[PDB]
Design a protein around this ligand. Structure first.
Ligand SMILES: OC[C@H]1O[C@@H](O[C@@H]2[C@@H](O)[C@H](O)O[C@H](CO)[C@H]2O)[C@H](O)[C@@H](O)[C@@H]1O
Ligand SMILES: OC[C@H]1O[C@@H](O[C@@H]2[C@@H](O)[C@H](O)O[C@H](CO)[C@H]2O)[C@H](O)[C@@H](O)[C@@H]1O
Ligand SMILES: OC[C@H]1O[C@@H](O)[C@H](O)[C@@H](O)[C@@H]1O
Lengths: 1038, 518
């Protein structure tokens, strides 16, 4: 559970971070570190613009950690030593889930140093805790003078770009106050925004240091005392010449400087003696809160209790995936992976009585992902933002681990789909609002001077943390919980969503996984889910240009650059929902079936000229976003075609399963009728031709008419359809898609293709300024791993899947030395206009590297397809917890975005992981773990009755010596298997004898066989079973 | 005439810069320095987005000059020394009008070091010249291994904000080529924009080092060879443990890194002996210009002649205010003040036969004026644009020092007063245009394939530097001066003026001074 690295100074560099969780009733912070110096480079409160230690990218972090990080100076009998400055002295590093500790053992000076880090949990102030201890390991008494702290503290109110670009002029606003009380307060004199409405800052940073007794020490805020003329912060010139007592009596400057924070003590240590310091660095809202917090002394017991609480917080957070196998690295990796998935996706919780809330979420923006602008609210019930794809993928298995979530994720992520099939990029924090009538009714039993403020606050959008802060401000330190619960309960949820950057062509493909996962826990709720009318529609900000206005000419030929219609761009911060009566009525609502029909109809009308792929006409590529220039070359993708085929098949099956009446909007009905008329025509033409220019023109004209109709508003009337007509129309669409897939497979070769690029040699210029293409020439593309991954989800024969696996394993997508699968083949012979993927060195980032996400997707598809032996063999070699820590160059408990492959020209980078944790492979590993431990479908419905059964698939190298393997089912129930012998247990090669159930009240029940039906299934799903005993082929034997 | 500061490392900090004048027929560069380390922090060609050494504000400059600036390592009999790193060893600093020189006298090791800087004048390539010399002041022969250069060269095509915001991701595009020829070329291969359009990059930076004979040395572009695992760039771990000859045979990575440029030699010095290196760091638009420039070997005579020309340029520029009094400080201050006024206002010169032109003007941003975005045209007859108030004040006494100017300033600055009494903020740089008939008549005596391009270029607004570049591109290295003079003479002046920001209430009060001075 703890990873130890020896002599990390000379090892290869890597970056990581503390989780930053501070509990429900706490203020979180973000902190990053590297394996150099004292291993902290930057930390703050909210984002990059509120940093206490300046934020740097990884390259600058590795270079500036030793100078701008935490510093420590020891003077022993007149000579100055600096720990963690020379790599030839033995040092050590320990990493926990929610902590960090380093130590150094200098055998020449006979002094040992140790410093630990953790975030302060469960308080009204967010801060970083640092404990430094120095021990005298010599045989004679010594006289010690110690100085510890940081050399550069950014005053509150200074933005990141102000420090990066104009850090010299910005020093005029900086100041530090309250030195006498021992609580320095760093803030600007006035707001640096020349056009502001405050001109006064209440918040600020602070620092406090004390010994075990708890009495605060006198700080040093002038860096010129320690370093004198050396402005490089490398030599403590001032400290080498004068005693600490003389320095503490000096006069310090508090204005027109970049202040620091140093604390010092003087002591004489007996042989074996030691001394310890405790430090707190953080941010407070105002001086009154700081005085209230420091009204009572803080001593060693307080800090050790806080450390225990910090450890227990992460332990309880990750307790939901606890498992025991034959290797402890597997269990530690499972816990760390679950923690990272929670960090990037959020942790569901039950707030009030009818609200579901996600906490601890944020945007992956670590030192190596320097292009992301992360955010994290510094308040109770903290939450953050994120991108559509990442948050959509990370919440795939929430229902299994928390049954009370229900259909919330489906409703949330199907309500962000616009009427034109696209969606915004960013998802924002949840917020609530309360009507004036309910506010008046609830707040009758409170004083008027408080009632007015409370109602004025509650009549505006707010977050639960803001409400808690308002209650603390108004009612004081103590306030009633029932009033807060009622206010939360009677509030209304507000919509969220920001356009952000543009339109991708793959964001809609991850929604079906939510439905498939939900139906694996509540199989009998399908009809209710399909015809529930709660779903809303987001209001688009920009519209896509028509095809004739989307093309421009250049010396290299015809291109596609003007994807978006900039003239019809709506302003932000406006209405975010589609309303009836052309934007003047109430909110429009749809059923899930209507959303599925809308997605099926629109995406079918985006096929390319040859009718094989789906055009990326939004200006952005698909999942592989390193090919940013592909949309300029009339690109199209086959993965979208495979996903469309799967969605159409599922929709047809759903329509045939539950006959009834379906209500559709007028514009969608007309568009669907036009598409049906088009597709029933030319049916003999698409089956007997190569180019389909006429069909492309017809479908594009229909789609453009629909877009232009629906962008400006919709009346709101509904048409009525019977399920049979929709089923027939979708069957025709599926037949067309299947023919296109067959044509693409024939054209490409033995491995299914992924992308296509078209050349238009001849065209026509229209009188309106548009350009009309006249012919298309397809061009092949190198092999990509996404193709087979998407293809294996389609229903095909087992032999074809095995043949595809054999073809892939001996192709260029398999790395022989590393026994891993690369993301793509060689791009050397392709055009340089594909994007930045061509400019990357082979074996780096998204270029012929071992991208972990796609490899885990491929392994999961292999497991789901029934190829158990191959899945086991490849998982034994590809999994992170089975790697060599020396070659991997990192903790084997943490995931990585990619691993450099053998094509990398640097011999010392082959096999290393980069871009830290918080990758998308966490959810893939969670799905693989769940399917291995419990099977594909734990719950089934038979004869209108719930049925529960288990079907594990466990390899030999995971069964312990005694044959007892245990795992957590739905995070509440423990399942304990007992296997007869040491062998691979594949479904169909074993039979379960009996099961024993232990209820929470002490009662027991025994069931013979592997099937349970009736009330016991309801009890086990409801969480009324505490433990299960499962026997496979009787007791274990050796 | 020269100001000498002793032990500048322990003194109070200050910032300054080279004037950055390369003459009429030269490419100017901008360079800033502080009184720490080896006293160079950043330099480029055009603006902050075309820097060769990364631009920092004054605070970051003071903090990082000792690590990201020029470095020098000396190995004497197995021990490695670094000059200009310890302030307890006596050092020196000399400041000229258009130059800078530093030196260190180490009495313990017995070796002295001297470094000089100056901008390369009168050439088609803008670059910085650096000369390093080491003298053996001991009494016995020593075996010397020298390494000198800079540890961070920004490849061409990388913007400042991309370097200071996403410098980790930006390393994927960086690469260096042409190591065998001795002329490394630093550039990115394609645009870094996240758009559907991808462009091609042709420009790049370069470096070249040689001894007195003129033969170029073998460069080192992988910083991991020198510093090994120490990413703080403080100790040369790799150089201490291995000989330089072994390092020169090592394999170097040329991708996914922030490249450096170090050159090394090995020599045994007799008592009183010395060795010298000459360096050139600059920026070019395409490899063809670099090959044309380096078509002939450069040696010590070339560099010393260039240094003499660089000094004489400033001397002749400031000769107009020469005076002799009872104090030399006053006399030097007069010339320095005149040079600074010329830099911020421009130097009036007589171009053609009926045109008046101002050279050396620019935007005056620097390390301490970090809020300004300075610019400077990298071409012949360099000029720039400035504010109304500053240019109005700086050209007050032009008529006294140059009677041929006449009433040009009055006409120019009284024509920017609008009908409501206010004025625009910015004054644009001078540009010219030629009519169709004059272009047809002038270009009769030239070949048609050149005549068409010449008339197409001349029928659009242009600057004299652009015209010189076009003439060099078309006619080659040699072209007729009379044709250029006629084209300039028969051209027409374009009206200048840009609104920009808004209306101040004092800009109109400086116009009467021009009339009173005239
Ligand atoms: O391929 C590397 C990563 O690129 C990221 O896109 C970056 C943009 O956000 C940013 O604005 O520009 C840079 C440089 O053009 C882009 O690299 C993607 O968002 C990542 O998914 C990708 O891993
Ligand atoms: O007062 C200092 C200097 O301020 C400069 O304006 C700055 C702006 O250019 C910048 O965008 O914002 C900062 C902070 O508000 C301003 O100080 C003036 O241009 C200078 O004349 C002045 O000396
Ligand atoms: O480009 C490959 C991957 O890079 C990373 C992004 O977060 C993903 O959305 C993308 O699929």
């Amino acid at each position: 559970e703890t990873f130890v690295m020896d002599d990390y100074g000379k090892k290869s560099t890597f970056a990581s971070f503390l989780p930053g969780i501070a509990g429900i009733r706490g203020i979180p912070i973000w902190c990053y570190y590297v394996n150099r110096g004292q291993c902290v480079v930057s930390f703050g409160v909210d984002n990059k613009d509120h940093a206490i230690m300046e934020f740097y990218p990884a390259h600058q972090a590795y270079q500036n950690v030793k100078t701008t990080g935490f510093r420590t100076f020891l003077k022993k009998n007149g000579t100055v030593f600096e720990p963690f400055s020379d790599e030839n002295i033995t040092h050590r590093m320990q990493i926990h889930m929610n902590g960090l500790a380093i130590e150094e053992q200098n055998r020449s000076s006979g002094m040992d140093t140790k410093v630990v880090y953790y975030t302060l949990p469960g308080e009204n102030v967010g801060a970083l805790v640092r404990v430094v201890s120095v021990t005298n390991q010599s045989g004679e008494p010594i006289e010690l003078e110690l100085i510890d702290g940081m050399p550069a503290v950014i005053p509150y109110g200074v933005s990141m770009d102000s420090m990066k670009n104009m850090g010299q002029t910005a020093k005029a606003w900086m100041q530090v106050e309250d030195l006498s009380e021992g609580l320095p307060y760093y803030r600007v004199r006035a707001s640096m925004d020349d056009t502001a409405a405050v001109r006064r800052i209440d918040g600020g940073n602070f620092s406090a240091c004390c010994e075990a007794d708890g009495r605060r020490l006198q700080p040093i805020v002038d860096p010129s005392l320690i370093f004198s003329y050396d402005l490089s912060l490398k030599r403590p010139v001032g400290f080498e010449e004068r005693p600490l007592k003389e320095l503490l009596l000096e006069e310090q400057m508090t204005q027109n400087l970049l202040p620091c924070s140093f604390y010092g003590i003087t002591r004489t240590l007996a042989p074996g003696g030691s001394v310890t310091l405790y430090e707190l660095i953080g941010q407070v809202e105002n001086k009154q809160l700081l005085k209230e917090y420091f009204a009572e002394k803080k001593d060693a017991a307080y800090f050790e209790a806080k450390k225990r609480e910090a450890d227990e917080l992460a332990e309880a957070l990750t307790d939901g995936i606890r498992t025991r196998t034959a290797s402890a690295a597997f269990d530690a990796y499972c816990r760390y992976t679950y923690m990272d998935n929670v960090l990037r996706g959020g942790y569901p919780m039950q707030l009030g009585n009818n609200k579901i809330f996600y906490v601890y979420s944020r945007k992956h923006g670590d030192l190596e992902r320097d292009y992301n602008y992360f955010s994290m609210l510094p308040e109770f019930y903290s939450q953050g933002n994120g991108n559509f794809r990442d948050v959509n993928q990370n919440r795939r298995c929430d229902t299994f681990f928390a049954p009370f979530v229900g259909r919330k994720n489906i409703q949330e992520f199907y309500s962000l789909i616009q009427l034109d099939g696209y969606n915004p990029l960013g998802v924002e924090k949840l917020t609530y609002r309360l009507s004036k009538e309910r506010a008046k009714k609830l707040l009758t039993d409170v004083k008027e001077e408080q009632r007015s403020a409370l109602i004025d606050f509650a009549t505006k959008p707010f977050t639960p943390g803001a409400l808690c802060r308002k209650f603390g401000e108004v009612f004081g330190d103590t306030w009633d919980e029932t009033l807060f619960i009622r206010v939360i309960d009677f509030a209304e949820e507000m919509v969220n969503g920001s356009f952000g950057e543009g339109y991708w062509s793959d964001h809609w493909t991850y929604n079906l996984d939510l439905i498939l996962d939900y139906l694996s826990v509540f199989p009998e709720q399908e009809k209710e889910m399909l015809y529930e009318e709660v779903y809303t529609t987001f209001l688009s900000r920009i519209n896509v240009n028509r095809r004739f206005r989307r093309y421009v000419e250049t010396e290299n030929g015809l291109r596609q650059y003007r994807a978006l219609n900039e003239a019809s761009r709506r302003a932000d911060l406006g209405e975010k929902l589609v309303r009836t009566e052309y934007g003047s009525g109430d909110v429009l609502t749809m059923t899930l079936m209507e959303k599925l029909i809308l997605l099926g109809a629109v995406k079918f009308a985006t096929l390319d000229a040859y009718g094989m792929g789906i055009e990326m006409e939004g200006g952005k590529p698909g999942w592989y976003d390193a090919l940013n220039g592909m949309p300029g070359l009339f690109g199209s993708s086959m993965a979208e075609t495979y996903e469309l085929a799967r969605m159409l098949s599922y929709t047809i099956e759903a329509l045939k399963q539950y006959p009834g009446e379906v209500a559709l909007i007028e514009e969608l009905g007309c568009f669907l009728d036009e598409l049906n008329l088009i597709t029933r025509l030319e049916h003999d033409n698409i089956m007997r031709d190569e180019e389909l220019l006429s069909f492309w023109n017809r479908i594009n004209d229909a789609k453009e008419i629909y877009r232009d109709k629906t962008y400006q508003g919709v009346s709101g009337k509904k048409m009525v359809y019977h399920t049979e007509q929709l089923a027939a129309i979708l069957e025709g669409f599926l037949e067309i898609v299947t023919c296109g897939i067959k044509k693409a497979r024939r054209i490409s070769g033995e491995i299914c293709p992924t992308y296509f690029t078209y050349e238009v040699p001849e065209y026509e210029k229209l009188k309106d300024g548009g350009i009309r293409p006249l012919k298309f020439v397809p061009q092949n593309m190198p092999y990509f791993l996404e193709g087979p991954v998407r293809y294996l989800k389609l229903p095909v024969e087992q032999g074809e899947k095995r043949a595809l696996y054999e073809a892939v394993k001996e192709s260029d997508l398999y790395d022989g030395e590393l026994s891993m699968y690369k993301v793509n083949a060689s791009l050397a012979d392709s055009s340089f206009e594909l994007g930045r993927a061509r400019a990357f060195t082979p074996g780096w980032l998204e270029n012929e590297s071992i991208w972990l996400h796609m490899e885990y997707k491929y392994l999961l598809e292999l497991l789901r397809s029934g190829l158990y032996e191959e899945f086991f063999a490849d998982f034994k070699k590809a999994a992170i917890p089975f790697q060599n820590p020396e070659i991997y160059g990192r903790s084997i408990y943490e995931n990585s975005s990619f691993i450099a492959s053998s094509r990398n020209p640097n011999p010392s980078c082959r096999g290393r992981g980069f871009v830290a944790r918080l990758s998308g492979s966490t959810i893939e590993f969670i799905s693989m773990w769940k399917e291995m431990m419990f099977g594909a479908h734990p719950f089934r419905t038979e004869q209108e009755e719930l049925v529960f059964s288990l079907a594990p698939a466990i390899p030999a190298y995971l069964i312990p010596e005694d044959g007892r393997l245990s795992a957590a089912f739905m995070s509440k129930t423990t399942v304990c298997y007992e296997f007869g012998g040491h062998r691979d247990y594949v479904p169909g090669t074993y039979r379960i004898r009996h099961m024993v159930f232990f209820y929470e009240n002490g009662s027991q029940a025994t069931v013979e066989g592997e099937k349970v039906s009736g009330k016991l299934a309801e009890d086990i799903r409801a969480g009324r079973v505490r433990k299960m005993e499962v026997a496979v082929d009787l007791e274990h034997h050796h």
